[PDB]
Structures are given as structure tokens and as C-alpha cells.
Design a protein around this ligand. Structure first.
Ligand SMILES: Nc1nc(-c2ccc(CNC(=O)Cc3ccc(NS(=O)(=O)c4ccccc4)cc3)cc2)c[nH]1
Length: 317
């Protein structure tokens, strides 16, 4: 038959088992992911030359396996504390005004549409920095955007419904202990995001002093009841119905702990206590001008509502 030289596995290697350069009927190859920071999906990666001339998996598939980076690993802004290396290894800095995102896989950044809209529609690549706690440091891992996807239902400067965006990177980032992606929420993930469950926001945005932070900060804050969050913003100068079902709110009735301007696009993360992995439930979106004030909650894009959209973009590009 003869199935030819196998295809390379990204973030992996193909190795001949029968012998080097041996690609005939019934022969065997072995595909491998780096198990520490990548996990092989699809199958065991044992493929055999079938009668039809196609490398075929043990399950009969004619396609490659997939090395998916390990997500949600962690070493563990108004009223918060200074992050340590590896606390938020998905944290991305995006340099317009100061903004942030979160790494997904090894080549996508999740952010807010409002944080990147002007830069996309000026047709300029985004300066994307990872692996640094210091916003102004010259030492960081550089990435560049290949493409920016704004949600088609987002209307810039006319409310924050559908305030979500994906940035495709030009190249895969090298995944190490200080640079790893956040997990997308699963079907069950809402069980960790009820009212009063605790999420974490991280960023370089304004602190209680009223200036940006030099070092990455974070704060733990509880999810707010949706009716209480709609009532907080159902008043002038906010337009009618500014808090939608595609948003969630987090903050304290007393004030003192909050995201703020400059934290835009950052991931509000939650711990799956069973998998022991962090996932993104929210994206820092908007709120009142006076961050940290009592009852003036931060508003976040509700990420689980966008999983079909995210999966459509990432699978198709
Ligand atoms: N109390 C609190 N605040 C935050 C927080 C604030 C801002 C940001 C970053 N987002 C922006 O910078 C976009 C952005 C742009 C303009 C406005 N003006 S508006 O008139 O209020 C308005 C709001 C909604 C619909 C229409 C008008 C607000 C936000 C992050 C957190 C947390 N907690």
C-alpha cells in the first residue's frame, strides 16, 4: 500500500516505530505531545498504514491528533494586592490606552471589544506582551496580532452588549511556567459562578490612588445578584437597559474592591474546585466612573454565553 512520510504534529513529534523511513502497509508510527504542558486529545496517537494508503488511528480516524496546551494552572484594580510570578500566567498586556487580555491555547487572546476596537479599525497590529508583571519593563515575551475578531453584535460607543473580542497571534507562544492559558468555562461552570461565589480580577488598571499600577495587581470579589446590578445602573446618565443578560456584576455593597479603567479586557477568573483549574467567567467591561464606590459594581461580559462564538472563530481560523 505505502502511506508516505507522516504529517508533523504541532507541539509534538512523529516518530517511526517499525524503523526510520518505514512507511508501508501495516507499518506503525507514534505521535507524541509534551505531556507536561500539552495534552494529546483525539486518540492515543498510534497510527497504522491501512489498505487505502492513509495513516489511520486506532479509532479509525484519518486525521491528526491534537496537542492542546494545559490550561488554568496557577501558583495560587481597587483594593487588591500585588501578583506573584505564575499567579496569572494567562495575563496579557495590550498596548491605544492600557488594556489587557487572557491567553487561550498558545495563539489566541481573549479581550474586550472596546479595548481593541479603535486599534483594529486603524488597521495597525496590536503590541501584545506576556510573561511580565511590570507594565513598563523592557523584558517580556513579544507577540503580534495576525487578526482581530470583534463580536458582530458589538456597537462601539452605544453600550457594552457583546463586548468581547478574539486576537489571533502571528505565531504560537512558547508555553512555560510563567506563560500558560486560562480554561474556557464548561457546561457545569455556572455552578462556580452563583451569587456570592468569588472571582478574581487582575490587571494594571487604576488603583485606589487614582493612577495605573506599575506591577500586576489582583483582587477577589463576589458575584452580585443580577437584579441588584441592573438597579445600580438604571439611572442617569446610563442608557435604558445598560446591564444585559450577557453581563455579570461583581463587587461589594460597601465598596472597596473593584476593577477599574485600565483593567479592560482582563479575565475575571474562577476556580473549578474539582478539576483544580482556573477558568474565565467574565471579561472586564465597564462600570461607573468612580471605581470602588459602594454599590457601583464592576460589569463584566458573561463569557459562557459566547462559547459557541469563540469556538466558531477558533475552529475556523
Ligand atoms: N464602579 C466601577 N467602574 C468600573 C469600571 C469602569 C470602566 C472600566 C473600563 N471600561 C471603559 O473604560 C469603557 C467605558 C466607556 C465609557 C463609560 N461611560 S458611561 O457613561 O458610564 C456609560 C456606561 C455604559 C453604557 C453607556 C455609558 C464607561 C466605560 C472598567 C471598570 C468598575 N467598577
Amino acid at each position: 500500500v505505502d502511506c508516505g512520510p507522516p504529517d508533523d504534529l504541532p507541539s509534538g513529534r512523529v516518530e517511526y516505530i517499525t524503523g526510520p523511513g518505514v512507511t508501508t502497509y501495516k507499518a506503525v508510527i507514534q505521535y507524541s505531545c509534551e505531556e507536561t504542558f500539552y495534552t494529546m486529545k483525539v486518540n492515543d496517537g498510534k497510527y497504522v498504514c491501512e489498505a487505502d494508503g492513509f495513516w489511520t488511528s486506532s479509532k479509525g480516524e484519518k486525521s491528526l491528533p491534537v496537542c492542546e496546551p494545559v490550561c488554568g494552572l496557577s501558583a495560587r484594580i481597587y483594593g487588591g494586592q500585588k501578583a506573584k510570578p505564575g499567579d496569572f500566567p494567562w495575563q496579557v498586556l495590550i498596548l491605544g490606552t492600557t488594556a489587557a487580555g487572557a491567553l487561550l491555547y498558545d495563539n489566541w487572546v481573549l479581550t474586550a471589544a472596546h479595548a481593541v476596537y479603535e486599534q483594529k479599525h486603524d488597521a495597525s497590529a496590536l503590541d501584545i506582551r506576556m510573561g511580565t508583571l511590570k507594565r513598563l519593563s523592557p523584558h517580556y515575551t513579544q507577540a503580534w496580532s495576525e487578526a482581530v475578531f470583534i463580536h458582530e453584535g458589538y456597537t462601539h460607543d452605544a453600550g457594552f452588549d457583546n463586548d468581547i473580542a478574539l486576537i489571533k497571534l502571528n505565531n504560537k507562544v512558547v508555553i512555560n511556567s510563567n506563560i500558560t492559558p486560562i480554561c474556557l468555562p464548561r457546561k457545569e461552570a455556572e455552578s462556580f459562578m452563583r451569587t456570592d461565589d468569588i472571582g478574581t480580577a487582575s490587571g494594571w488598571g487604576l488603583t485606589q490612588r487614582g493612577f495605573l499600577a506599575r506591577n500586576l495587581m489582583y483582587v477577589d470579589i463576589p458575584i452580585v445578584d443580577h437584579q441588584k446590578c441592573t438597579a445600580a445602573y438604571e439611572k442617569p446618565p446610563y442608557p435604558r437597559g445598560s446591564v444585559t443578560a450577557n453581563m455579570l456584576c461583581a463587587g461589594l455593597e460597601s465598596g472597596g474592591k473593584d476593577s477599574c479603567r485600565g483593567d479592560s479586557g482582563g479575565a475575571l477568573v474562577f476556580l473549578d474546585s474539582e478539576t483544580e483549574r482556573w477558568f474565565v467567567g467574565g471579561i472586564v467591561s465597564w462600570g461607573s466612573m468612580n471605581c470602588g464606590e459602594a454599590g457601583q459594581y464592576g460589569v463584566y461580559t458573561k463569557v459562557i454565553n459566547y462559547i459557541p462564538w469563540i469556538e466558531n472563530i477558533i475552529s475556523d481560523f
